[PDB]
Amino acid sequence: ESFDLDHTKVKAPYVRLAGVKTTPKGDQISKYDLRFLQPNQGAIDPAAIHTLEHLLAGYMRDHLEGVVDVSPMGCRTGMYMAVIGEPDEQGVMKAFEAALKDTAGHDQPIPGVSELECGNYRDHDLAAARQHARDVLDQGLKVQETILL
């Protein structure tokens, strides 16, 4: 359910199946590591990753069915997303690429930003979230194999 990854051997940015949990009725939940930054070489600011969370919640769903949710990782170098379905790194990679283009081009208010809809509405940074999305697309994504410790 959670592969033991060697963080010194991956090459960001990438999409990686991080684990798979089988449900009691026989379905599968695939977990993905959506890595923007190389582990231990810098982190996304908290405001920017919060904004990425709000933007990717809707844009990943526009390009991929079965999304449970997209969340920030505590290490702030990427996002975690669980999907209901069999593993499909290629398809998730294409959906992530399309959602990042949407994110980089998002030039309207951030969705769900108010004291009513967000637990820290003052901590957002649209420009930095858009630049991180452009940065990933500029470097280029790939499907990263899990290298175990």
Binding positions for Fe cation:
50, 54, 118
Burial of 112 (0-12, 13-18, 19+ CB in 10 A): middle
- Does residue 123 belong to the site contacting its own copies (CB under 8 A)? yes
Helix (H, G, I), strand (E, B) or coil at 25: coil
Number of Cβ within 10 Å of residue 118's Cβ equals 17
Indicate which single residue of 68, 75, 84, 143 sits in contact with Zn ion (rule: CB under 5 A). 75
Smallest gap from Cβ 72 to its own copies, in A, equals 5
- Beta carbon nearer to its own copies, 111 or 134: 111
Specify which residues 19 forms β-bridges with. Answer: 31
Residue 11 within binding range of its own copies, rule CB under 8 A: no
Torsions phi, psi of 62, nearest 5?
-70, -25
Binding site for its own copies (CB under 8 A): 2, 4-8, 21, 23-27, 29, 31, 35, 37, 39-40, 43, 46, 49-54, 68-69, 71-78, 80, 82, 84, 115-123, 149
